[PDB]
């Protein structure tokens, strides 16, 4: 019931009942939260509601003191004092933003924007409370009971009546009934169990609630500078291989913690490991949000680092297969590989965080929280894709507003650039250089002569929401027989329901554009599907061309797209 002020520190009885999180507001800061919010509840050790029997005020602006009790204007004694006075609420030891963040139903683009331009207490309010709020949405969808199930990989389901229905996407994991987690993709419905278990008629699912813990780390620790490298021991016998990275290296270990955009391809990975190398003695461990981001880590790992100092962190709650060629659970091994809610209490010389523009200021305090190191490192690329923000449906949400991260990165620019992209055709690195990394990113590669493009609009059906057009792929199909070579090609576009339609179709292997991030093929046949601000996203667009080490298809939608598109233009 004594805690700290969330805005000023100060220490207080006060917490707003009507928050969400509950936070501690001294005296000062919590009357202009109530003065200025529909939040008139306040809680102490008894909360601010008038003692009168059977009475039901409990606005705090319309409640007194008589003695060391509370009551309302009918009930106060005449030798009373109001809670609201003189800019305080009555407590012990006697905001504009915290109000937004506090009030906000995180539906806007804008609260995203001040929960990551606000103060760093209130990043960590702002985090707690958006992620508390998406999970409350998760009890407003209906529960989904198997009516008849045909065969080991597809089943029909039974909606309940009232509550609306969640997106049928891999971003949706239910849990089975406790059956282990469960998907579904498209009244012919594929179901993806964790577990496989006899899927029984009646067993019903409903999506995975998890209670948010509260944040006490910051987003960012300070940043410190340093005149030498500070807990780190260097080699001179450094692989000509991680040369290029030796002054970036030495960066690392001089301040607390470092940036590196790295645009697609351009060696993250080879960076990452290649800091092992350099500090040899360190103890690193290496951290994403994701199980795939974490394995792709772990195979450059294998192919440079000591197989017997590495372990896969793996929860006891196992979700999905992941890299199985290290020691699993150890760890006290010098490397270790986790996903951010995996993580274990522990300390270490360097922190490794890839993919941080998938990171939420949430992912960026739990890591603070369970790792105490002399130096984070932060990998990603802020022109590549966000986490879904599975509340927002109105305005977009820029780069500098990801997370902390990435806001550094588009304001004071990235600690390192990593310039040349070695995977894709110069056509792919020209046209992403120009559109998201203002001239900066240069191509190994020389043109493939394997780039094309189409502009064909087609016709744009929906399953539900996720968009189809069959057209587009109609056009990939004729462009199949007479390019055999892209037999081999992944089909890629912004939407499931596409992708369902082009893996019976085409028979290619299929990847939205989220799914692929971090992922390279030969060969991508990408169909933009519609013209919208999902399919137009700039860092969707860049994420989907730079899959590609040798050749591309784009059939767009958008003029704007394709004009920008260097490749060789096709017909039809
Ligand atoms: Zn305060
Ligand atoms: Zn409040
Ligand atoms: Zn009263």
Known sequence: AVGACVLCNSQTSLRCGACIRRPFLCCKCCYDHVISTSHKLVLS????????????????????????????????????????????????????????????????????????????????????????????????????????????????????????????????????????????????????????????????????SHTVMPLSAPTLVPQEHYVRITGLYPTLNISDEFSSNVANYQKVGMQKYSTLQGPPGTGKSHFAIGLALYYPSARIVYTACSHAAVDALCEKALKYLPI????????????????????????????????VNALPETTADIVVFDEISMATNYDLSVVNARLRAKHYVYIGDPAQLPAPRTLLTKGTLEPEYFNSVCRLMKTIGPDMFLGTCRR?????????????????????????????????????????????????????????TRNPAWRKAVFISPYNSQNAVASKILGLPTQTVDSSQGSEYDYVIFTQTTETAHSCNVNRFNVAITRAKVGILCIMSDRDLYDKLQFTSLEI
């Open 424 to 480: 894709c055709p110069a056509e792919i690195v020209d046209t992403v250089s120009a559109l998201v990394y203002d001239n900066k990113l240069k191509a190994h590669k020389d043109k493939s002569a394997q780039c094309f493009k189409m502009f064909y609009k087609g016709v744009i059906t929906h399953d539900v929401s996720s968009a189809i057009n069959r057209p587009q792929i109609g056009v990939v199909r004729e462009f199949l």
């Open 45 to 208: 050790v008894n909360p601010y509601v008038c003692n009168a029997p059977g009475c039901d005020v409990t606005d705090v602006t319309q409640l007194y003191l008589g003695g060391m009790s509370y009551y309302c204007k009918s009930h106060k004694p005449p030798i009373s004092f109001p809670l609201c006075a003189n800019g305080q609420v009555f407590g012990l030891y006697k905001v504009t933003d915290f109000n937004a963040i506090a009030t906000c139903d995180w539906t806007n683009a804008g609260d995203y924007i001040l929960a990551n331009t606000c103060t760093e207490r209130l990043k960590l309010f702002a985090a707690e409370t958006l992620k508390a709020t998406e999970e409350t949405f998760k009890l407003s969808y209906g529960i989904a009971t198997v009516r008849e199930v045909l065969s080991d990989r597809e089943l029909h389901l039974s909606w309940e009546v009232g509550k609306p229905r969640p997106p049928l996407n891999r971003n949706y994991v239910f849990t089975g009934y406790q059956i282990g987690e469960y998907t579904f993709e498209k009244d012919a419905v594929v179901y993806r169990g964790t577990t496989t278990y006899k899927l029984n008629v009646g067993d019903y699912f409903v999506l995975t």
């Open 308 to 339: 017997d100092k590495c372990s896969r962190i793996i929860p006891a709650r196992a979700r999905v297969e992941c890299f199985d060629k290290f020691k699993v659970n150890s760890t006290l091994e010098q490397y270790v590989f986790c996903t």
